[PDB]
């Protein structure tokens, strides 16, 4: 794998982590299909001494047009440890999501993850795959729409898109899996086009918690939430201030 010319948002660095802020069509990993133009790219062109860090100090990655922070490895003694953590559930992977359906509770998803029996670059929830968590709140109620913050406990392929999808509740925007129905009846113009062209899935890495590998102090980092999604949730909370006027009033 070689170095390319890709700028990387850098939130933090030190002498042993970087914590990355990753945009939307960016791929984490050279994979099938991705020879290329990957983060791996991008970290071997900032820091070619990370070539010598295991898989270029990456540690767990975020789907291409999901945005958000990563945590990187610089060095051989940060890359153990990180693994360590992530393996021990000591390290805190928060998400900002905006879900398809009126949703009334947060709860877990504990469901294992395969490849999708017939279609080869989708997921699917199947009890013989690999066991997979997803936790999740609700920190805002929409009309048909619910705004949830995710953490997990395991990084499964898609397995946030996936899991939210197994319980009826994909995300808006998700090309896979089923994140474009109409537009909920009486939308506004603006609610109807801002859904329009909201074409990922409304996943963003929000915030990294954790014990810092080499000093052990506990640190915490956060992105915040990227102009597309703050659009998209304005717009579902304005409908839904238009709803609660209708309705809240005896």
């Given at each position: 794998?070689e170095?390319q010319?890709?700028p990387?948002?850098?939130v933090y660095?030190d002498?042993?982590?970087?914590?990355?802020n990753?945009?939307?069509?960016?791929?984490?990993?050279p994979?099938a299909?991705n020879?290329?133009?990957?983060?791996?790219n991008a970290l071997?062109?900032?820091?070619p001494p990370?070539?010598d860090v295991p898989?270029?100090?990456?540690?767990?990655?975020l789907?291409?047009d999901?945005?958000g922070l990563?945590?990187?490895?610089?060095?051989?003694?940060?890359?153990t440890?990180?693994?360590?953590?992530?393996q021990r559930?000591?390290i805190?992977?928060?998400?900002?999501a905006?879900?398809?359906?009126?949703?009334?509770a947060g709860?877990?998803?504990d469901?294992?993850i395969?490849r999708?029996?017939?279609?080869?670059?989708?997921?699917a929830?199947?009890?013989?795959?690999?066991?997979?968590?997803?936790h999740?709140?609700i920190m805002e109620?929409?009309?048909?729409?619910?705004?949830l913050?995710?953490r997990?406990?395991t990084?499964?392929?898609?397995?946030?898109?996936?899991?939210?999808?197994?319980?009826?509740?994909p995300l808006?925007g998700?090309?896979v899996?089923?994140?474009?129905?109409?537009?909920?009846?009486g939308?506004?113009?603006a609610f109807?086009?801002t859904?329009?062209k909201?074409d990922?899935?409304?996943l963003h890495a929000?915030?990294?918690?954790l014990?810092h590998?080499?000093?052990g102090?506990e640190?915490?980092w956060h992105?915040?939430?990227?102009q597309?999604?703050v659009?998209?949730?304005?717009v579902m909370?304005?409908?839904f201030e238009e709803?609660?006027?209708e309705?809240?009033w005896?």
């Open positions: 794998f170095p010319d890709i990387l948002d850098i660095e002498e042993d982590i970087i914590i990355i990753k945009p939307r069509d960016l791929v984490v990993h994979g299909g020879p290329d133009g990957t983060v791996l071997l062109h900032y820091y990370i070539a898989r270029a100090g990456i540690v767990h990655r789907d291409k999901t945005t990563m945590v990187v490895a610089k060095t051989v003694p940060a890359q440890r990180l693994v360590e953590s992530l559930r000591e805190t992977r928060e998400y900002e905006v879900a398809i359906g009126h949703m009334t709860g877990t998803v469901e294992p395969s999708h029996p017939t279609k080869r670059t989708h997921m929830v199947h009890p013989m795959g690999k066991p997979a968590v997803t999740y709140r109620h929409f009309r048909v729409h619910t705004r913050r995710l997990l406990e990084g499964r392929t898609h397995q946030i898109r996936v899991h939210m999808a197994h319980i009826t509740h808006v998700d090309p899996y089923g994140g474009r129905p109409r537009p909920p009846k939308a506004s113009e109807i086009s859904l329009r909201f990922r899935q409304a929000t915030m990294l918690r014990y590998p080499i000093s102090i640190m915490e992105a915040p939430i990227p597309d999604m659009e998209l949730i304005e909370r304005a409908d709803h609660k006027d309705v809240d005896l």
